[PDB]
Amino acid sequence: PTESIVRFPNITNLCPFGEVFNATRFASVYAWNRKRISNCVADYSVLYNSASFSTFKCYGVSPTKLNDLCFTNVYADSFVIRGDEVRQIAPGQTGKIADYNYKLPDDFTGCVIAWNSNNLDSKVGGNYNYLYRLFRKSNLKPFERDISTEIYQAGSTPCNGVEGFNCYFPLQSYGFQPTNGVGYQPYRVVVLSFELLHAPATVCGPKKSTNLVKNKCVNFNFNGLTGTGVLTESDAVRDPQTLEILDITPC
Amino acid sequence: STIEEQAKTFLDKFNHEAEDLFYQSSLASWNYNTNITEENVQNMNNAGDKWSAFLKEQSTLAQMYPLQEIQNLTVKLQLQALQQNGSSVLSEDKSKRLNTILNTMSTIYSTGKVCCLLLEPGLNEIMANSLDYNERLWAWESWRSEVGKQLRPLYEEYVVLKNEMARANHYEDYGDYWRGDYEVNGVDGYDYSRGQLIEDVEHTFEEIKPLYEHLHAYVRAKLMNAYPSYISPIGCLPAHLLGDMWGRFWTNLYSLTVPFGQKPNIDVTDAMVDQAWDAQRIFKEAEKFFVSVGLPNMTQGFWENSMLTDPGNVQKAVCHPTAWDLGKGDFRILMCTKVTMDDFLTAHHEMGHIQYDMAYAAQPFLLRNGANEGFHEAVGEIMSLSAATPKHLKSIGLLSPDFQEDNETEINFLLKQALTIVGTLPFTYMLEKWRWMVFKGEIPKDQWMKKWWEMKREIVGVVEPVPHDETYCDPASLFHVSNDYSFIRYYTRTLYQFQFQEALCQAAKHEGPLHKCDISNSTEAGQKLFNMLRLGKSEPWTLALENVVGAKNMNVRPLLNYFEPLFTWLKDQNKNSFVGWSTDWSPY
Ligand SMILES: *[C@@H]1O[C@H](CO)[C@@H](O[C@@H]2O[C@H](CO)[C@@H](O)[C@H](O)[C@H]2NC(C)=O)[C@H](O)[C@H]1NC(C)=O
Ligand SMILES: *[C@@H]1O[C@H](CO)[C@@H](O)[C@H](O)[C@H]1NC(C)=O
Ligand SMILES: *[C@@H]1O[C@H](CO)[C@@H](O)[C@H](O)[C@H]1NC(C)=O
Ligand SMILES: *[C@@H]1O[C@H](CO)[C@@H](O)[C@H](O)[C@H]1NC(C)=O
Ligand SMILES: *[C@@H]1O[C@H](CO)[C@@H](O)[C@H](O)[C@H]1NC(C)=O
Ligand SMILES: *[C@@H]1O[C@H](CO)[C@@H](O)[C@H](O)[C@H]1NC(C)=O
Ligand SMILES: *[C@@H]1O[C@H](CO)[C@@H](O)[C@H](O)[C@H]1NC(C)=O
Ligand SMILES: *[C@@H]1O[C@H](CO)[C@@H](O)[C@H](O)[C@H]1NC(C)=O
Ligand SMILES: [Zn+2]
Incomplete structure (x- = not known):
């Protein structure tokens, strides 16, 4: 190989990672939020080394490789739970959170981030704002949200639309106080998800690109794909910046 | 569905x-x-x-x-x-009469005017240190003639109301309702009756009787010297000489009945005063003992929220040593710690209660309790039993290194423990057999005092210094009797306290007698204990016992093994004096 080139899309706008993580108001777990970040160059190493996180785990993606990779879209789901149930935020787990509140698939390509937030969102006398679903007829399909307040008919009698004996309201409210233990203290959780489709890449970075050379046998990196060969003007890898089609031939 | x-x-x-x-x-x-x-x-x-x-x-x-x-x-x-109905099953009219009776009994005991002297610390100090034959007789008779006289008519109504309340809840009598804690049903091979408790309580006391008869004859033969011509060698001990108002603990008799007087004990108050222990280091040493036996550390919120030193005169707080488990992962200890060996022992006792409450935090709300009522205090006591041996204080900076021990010290120590442990078992057994007999109806209402003082002489060997007719009420003076508490928890706490210690001393591979066995630096014993602390109440107490000791019933053999050197020394000392007693001789 005579010379090495890396070709990436020319997009120099920073991703709103300061808005998902430092959001003023996080949302109840039973009705979580989703933000799709697209057309952006996003650095993760500083996020990794922020060192304010209690739990930072990734699945299907190596922790350092994601710094230089190309995905079609990135989603961010932000909510609040107790410290003890953070274990349930993972593929193939069960409980009152991963059955009726927030279900993840087994083939997960994202990163779970969680950090204690006792100082911000607990107060004396209790912080009863954060509700969570407690009773549901059936488990939640991966990435589905049911924010209804159907009265749980737990037995046989028709419930008629009012609670009482054997008719339970399914949303129950977390109780947070400053004096609680670690197991009962409020953790804020942000789940990143990375999706890739046939569409032209939109979240790629950061990594500076280089020039394009032809008629030599060179090393190339297009949108995170690696290869060694002669690139010829027209096994056929489109140039991202100018949207041309460049063929490939072994040397 | x-x-x-x-x-x-x-x-x-x-x-x-x-x-x-x-x-x-x-x-x-x-x-x-x-x-x-x-x-x-x-x-x-x-x-x-x-x-x-x-x-x-x-x-x-x-x-x-x-x-x-x-x-x-x-x-x-x-x-x-x-699903337990409790007391609401009683009609509306008699529930307020019963609660009025309870309130009046508690009030009539709490405020007792002997003239004017109250109980704490008026009569208690006279009874615990007077060492005058007649002053302590006045201080005994006055209480038995005022506080016991004002409670006679009421306890007759308290008995019948509580009996009907217990009969409504499908039990036989209030004695059965009390006995029903030690009951397991439905688990094949581990079942336990409410008629089974009366048994085993008898086949365990009839097995400890010899040590008590030799301890009694030694105490009487050493008490004959002080009060010159009032005690007789054949007769029993009068009730006002037993070092307590109710004769419950013989500890105050240790000022007289010292086997080897000259040698002192391991008082290490000066060692901690010298090194300036700041009333907080004691709890850190306790935490390190628990960390070393293998259990988890203390939660952080314990250190900041808990009150471990009296706030001073500006803020007054009642501070009887206590361990608080407030739920939601919050634990605290309430003690007015002061630099004394006593608080060095109580710190390990309260810390063992806290370590018991952390174990079963995973269980549901209704199953967050000890396996039965006699399990929290055994756990809290074996840790204060191991943290007192001279080897452990030698491991810690205090207790200057050389300090070779001799047997003449270990006899002083054993007798000072025996007066406390094996002196209160025949009183707990007699009191809790009287209340069971009265609740069942075996003792008619005209034989309440005539049978109490026939239980005393045959079980506790204690005669009365003036005869009490039927009008008196002697048992109602005790705090547990008048305030309606159970009392058989103190007969089973003592036995469990030593079966746990034998099993965990065996698991530590200690060699030699049990009175100087230590558990620190033995992870296996800690895992053995945590395998039962974790269950909570979700499992039958026979299974919880089998996880530690290896038996499905309570025994007395380890308790006897603990006191074997003392038993031999006493069996040799008493041979000049008498053994046993006689029911005839009465001082009056
Ligand atoms: C359990 O093992 C520890 C070892 O970490 C012992 O701690 C030592 O105790 C001696 C006695 O004063 C000190 O001189 C050492 O400095 C301590 N540390 C070490 C690392 O040896 C502890 O004493 C042991 N427990 C008992 C009861 O002996
Ligand atoms: C969030 O706020 C903190 C504190 O001001 C800041 O250090 C951090 O850079 C912000 N953004 C992220 C992604 O943490
Ligand atoms: C940036 O990329 C766009 C892609 O449409 C291209 O048109 C533009 O010329 C590029 N700008 C550069 C390479 O400076
Ligand atoms: C409590 O009282 C109700 C009143 O009818 C009765 O049905 C129920 O069986 C009682 N509970 C017990 C344990 O007996
Ligand atoms: C837990 O105990 C170990 C052993 O002493 C110690 O090293 C560790 O720092 C302790 N951790 C906490 C949080 O107390
Ligand atoms: C104790 O109660 C008084 C009553 O208002 C209060 O003023 C004081 O602050 C309390 N003590 C503490 C330590 O808060
Ligand atoms: C009883 O129900 C609990 C869940 O509530 C379950 O874990 C346990 O296994 C059940 N008992 C048996 C014997 O299956
Ligand atoms: C052991 O204790 C006995 C009790 O009096 C004493 O006579 C003896 O000297 C002590 N020492 C030995 C080695 O027996
Ligand atoms: Zn205790």
């Missing part, structure tokens, strides 16, 4: 409300116990009222699920612990 599946849903709905109302009540009780001021009493009563009304209504709801269909055996236990 099925009752079991609808019950699991009801309990899922219950535990969530209950955890929060319980914590809201515990915080309001702590706030008053640390700040004994005004306005705090009202919050104490309000937080204790909302909990009581919520638990009453939730218990009324629980009934609607019949208990035969449920087969899980865990939901069976929660619903059993919830």
Whole structure:
């Protein structure tokens, strides 16, 4: 190989990672939020080394490789739970959170981030704002949200639309106080998800690109794909910046 | 659908409300116990009222699920612990008469005017240190003739009301309702009756009788010297000479009955004073002992929230050593720690209660308790039993290194423990057999005092210095009798206290007698203990016992093994004097 080139899309706008993580108001777990970040160059190493996180785990993606990779879209789901149930935020787990509140698939390509937030969102006398679903007829399909307040008919009698004996309201409210233990203290959780489709890449970075050379046998990196060969003007890898089609031939 | 599946849903709905109302009540009780001021009493009563009304209504709801269909055996236990009617089964009219009786009894005992001297510390100090034959007789008779005289008519109504309340709840008598804690049903091979407790309580005491007869004859033969011509070698000990108002603990007799007087004991108060222990280092040493035996560390909130030193005169708080478990992962210790070996022992005792409460935090709300009533105090006592041996204090900086021990010290130590441990077992057994006989109806209402003093002479060997007719009420003087508490928890605590110690000393591979065995730096024993601390109440107490000792019933053999050197020394000392007693000789 005579010379090495890396070709990436020319997009120099920073991703709103300061808005998902430092959001003023996080949302109840039973009705979580989703933000799709697209057309952006996003650095993760500083996020990794922020060192304010209690739990930072990734699945299907190596922790350092994601710094230089190309995905079609990135989603961010932000909510609040107790410290003890953070274990349930993972593929193939069960409980009152991963059955009726927030279900993840087994083939997960994202990163779970969680950090204690006792100082911000607990107060004396209790912080009863954060509700969570407690009773549901059936488990939640991966990435589905049911924010209804159907009265749980737990037995046989028709419930008629009012609670009482054997008719339970399914949303129950977390109780947070400053004096609680670690197991009962409020953790804020942000789940990143990375999706890739046939569409032209939109979240790629950061990594500076280089020039394009032809008629030599060179090393190339297009949108995170690696290869060694002669690139010829027209096994056929489109140039991202100018949207041309460049063929490939072994040397 | 099925009752079991609808019950699991009801309990899922219950535990969530209950955890929060319980914590809201515990915080309001702590706030008053640390700040004994005004306005705090009202919050104490309000937080204790909302909990009581919520638990009453939730218990009324629980009934609607019949208990035969449920087969899980865990939901069976929660619903059993919830479906108990308690005292509400009594009619409205007699429930306020009963609560009036209880209030009057507690008031009549708390405020006793002997003239004017009250009980604490008026009569207690006279009885514990007077060492004059007649002064302590006045201080005994006055109480037995005033506080016991004002409670006679009331206890006759308390008996019949509590008997009818216990008969309504499908038990036979109030004695059976009390006995029903040690009951396991449905687990094949581990069952336990309520008629089984009367047994084993008798085949364990009839096995400890020889050591008590030799300890009695040694105490009498050493008490003959002090009060010259009032005790007779054949006769029993009068009741006012036993070093306590009720003759419950013989500890105050240790100022006289010293086997080897010259040698002192391991008083290490000066060692801690010299090195300037700041009333907090003691708890750190306790934490390190627990960390070394293998259990987890203390939670962080313990160190900041808990009150471990009296706040001073500006803030007054009642501080009887206590370990608080407020739920929601919150633990605290309330002690006015002072630099003394006594607080070095109580710190390990209270810390063992805290370490017992952390173990079963994973269990549901209704199963967060000891396996039976006699398990918390055994756990809290074996740790203070191991943290007192001279080897352990030698390991720690204090107790200067050389300090070779001789047998003449270990006899002083053993006798000072025996007067406390094996002196209160025939009193607990006699008192709790009298109350069971009276509740069953074996003792008619005209033989209440005539049979008490025939139990005394045949079981405790204690004669009365003036005859009491039928009008008197002697047992009603005791705090537990008048305030309606159980008493057989102190007969089983002592036995469990030493079967645990034998099993864990065996698991540490210690060689030699048990009185100087230590457990620190033995991870295996700690794992053996935590394998039973973890269960909580979810498992039958025979299974919880089998996980540590290896038996399904309580025994007395380890307790006897602990005292074998003392027993031999006493069996040699008494041979000049008598053994046993006689029921005829009465001082009057
Ligand atoms: C359990 O093992 C520890 C070892 O970490 C012992 O701690 C030592 O105790 C001696 C006695 O004073 C000190 O001189 C050492 O400095 C301590 N540390 C070490 C690392 O040896 C501890 O004493 C042992 N427990 C008992 C009861 O002996
Ligand atoms: C969030 O706020 C903190 C504190 O100001 C800041 O250090 C951090 O850079 C912000 N953004 C992220 C992604 O943490
Ligand atoms: C940036 O990329 C766009 C892609 O449409 C291209 O048109 C533009 O010329 C590029 N700008 C550069 C390479 O400076
Ligand atoms: C104790 O109660 C009084 C009553 O208002 C209050 O002023 C005081 O601050 C309390 N003590 C503490 C330590 O808060
Ligand atoms: C009883 O129900 C609990 C869940 O509530 C379950 O874990 C346990 O295994 C059940 N008992 C039996 C014997 O299956
Ligand atoms: C409590 O009283 C109700 C009143 O009818 C009764 O049905 C229920 O069986 C009682 N509970 C027990 C444990 O006997
Ligand atoms: C837990 O105990 C170990 C052993 O002493 C110690 O090294 C560790 O720092 C402790 N951790 C906490 C949080 O107390
Ligand atoms: C052991 O104790 C006895 C009790 O009096 C004493 O006589 C003896 O000297 C002590 N020492 C030995 C080695 O027996
Ligand atoms: Zn205790």
